[PDB]
Amino acid sequence: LNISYTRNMTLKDGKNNVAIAVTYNHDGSYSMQIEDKTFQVLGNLYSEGDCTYLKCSVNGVASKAKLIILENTIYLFSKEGSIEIDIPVPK
């Protein structure tokens, strides 16, 4: 009510942690602030066969990739490349 909710989440890329501030916009898009740069992100998850795909647009650039979330690692598979991101484990 009368405020915008911002969520602080930490994602470990390689050996260095990264902190991301996510803002839940009213229209349904998200504004993520990483370091001093901000990105406008929107997308959805659609499943083809048994594979789940993520279609998203980042700052007006749209892309699709297969999304796999196994254990505390996030796998993003795409023609451009493959990305692995580790979710930190609570102590």
Binding site: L1, N2, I3, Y5, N8, P90, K91
Partner: protein, 541 residues
Amino acid sequence: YHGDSVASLGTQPDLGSALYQENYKQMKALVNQLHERVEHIKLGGGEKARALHISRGKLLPRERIDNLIDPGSPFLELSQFAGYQLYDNEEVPGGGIITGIGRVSGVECMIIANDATVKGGAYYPVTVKKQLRAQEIAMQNRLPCIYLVDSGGAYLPRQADVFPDRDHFGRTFYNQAIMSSKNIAQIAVVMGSCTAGGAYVPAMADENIIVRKQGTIFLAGPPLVKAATGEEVSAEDLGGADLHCRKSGVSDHWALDDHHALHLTRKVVRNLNYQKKLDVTIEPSEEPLFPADELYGIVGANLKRSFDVREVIARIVDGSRFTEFKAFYGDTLVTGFARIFGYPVGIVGNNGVLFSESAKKGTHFVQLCCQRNIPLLFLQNITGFMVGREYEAEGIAKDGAKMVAAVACAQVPKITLIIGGSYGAGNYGMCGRAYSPRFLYIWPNARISVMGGEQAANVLATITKDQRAREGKQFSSADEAALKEPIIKKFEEEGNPYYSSARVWDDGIIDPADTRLVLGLSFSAALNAPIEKTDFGIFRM
């Protein structure tokens, strides 16, 4: 066969009209002011206090609430403006406490968290009133209560307004015990050092979670112990997580830090063995046919002008479908059936001055809704009951009263929204704060007072002049004018929505664009409790 076609309410407003532009401008200014004030309140107690709180390793209360609730779930904060300019020189952002309704482990719960940055978590009278209101809401709706206890006890100055009376601090423990006896779960998370008043809260809770080092439960603090007994003792030794968990046995769970405590709290809720069941019928939800932002132009900020409440109804109901009841009888009052997010609701709105026919129609509609077990929604734009010699002869009092009686006796969930003026007995008739609605909200443009300021000055002036003439005293005409001008100012200051919400009178001011969402959340929360039978008193015919 649920597919028969039905006419829809509402009409497209004229955007080009200058009146629409002016109303939109005024409402936009009011909403921007409200948003900026809410931002400043959300800032917290202060920069130095926040820095110290973070340095002690604790989480800020809003961060605690964000981590506690389910990911992405909306949070319905209550009374954000409590304590706004309530005291002359002391600033109490949010009343020093945070209360709201959110979903924890798929269960709607009431959350009460102390803001340690505001006066070290000391309890002002407004803080006690806000906590009592939250507890009453939870008890009425049968919602589990979660306490994030970090407080320094009652504010030592102003003790008379916090300790002694019935609605003072002890009512907190009374409500805790009663709700525990009624199978409404109580969970206390000692996230910081409590005090004599704070210590009792975890003791009465069914389940306790205490942080390893920040959490400290002592019935009397070190300074308090020294002032009483004089026994010098460290805070951790007198009260600590390890001691309470191992020897005292007050603590029920041991948490390493704030995140661990919140995770443990989520687990306890999971183990509650509770399932929500609905009594009312449900239908698929559909959005209204018109944009909500047009309400700014439709309503505006001037109370003198009148607007059709049917527009407001059409912009907040599912599919803009409304079934009016007794449309042509007592047309100053609007009643009918609609659905919000699939929930049946009976809408009772004001379209003008209340008359005998309007009161009778409202009584009939309230009886119908109570019989069918349908939640009631009141839209207040009242400015009075028509009063006159002929109206008194008819029995306007009698008619007005029988509406009021029904409203009071009704047992269905009741939610009141004040979209305009609310004066005199009209406030009581349309489910005022004194009649225990489940929730009460006001728009930023609303004014609430016993009567309009000009009318009040005239009533006082006539009594003083007539009294003086009977006494043989002389009342100067200039003196009458001097008394009236302050009255208009005093009534305006008290009527302002911010003044009303500073006291706990309103569950909060809400942007008109968010009315549908707020009502949906409120009704979803209120549907947890079963709907009881309604017993009516004598209806004076």
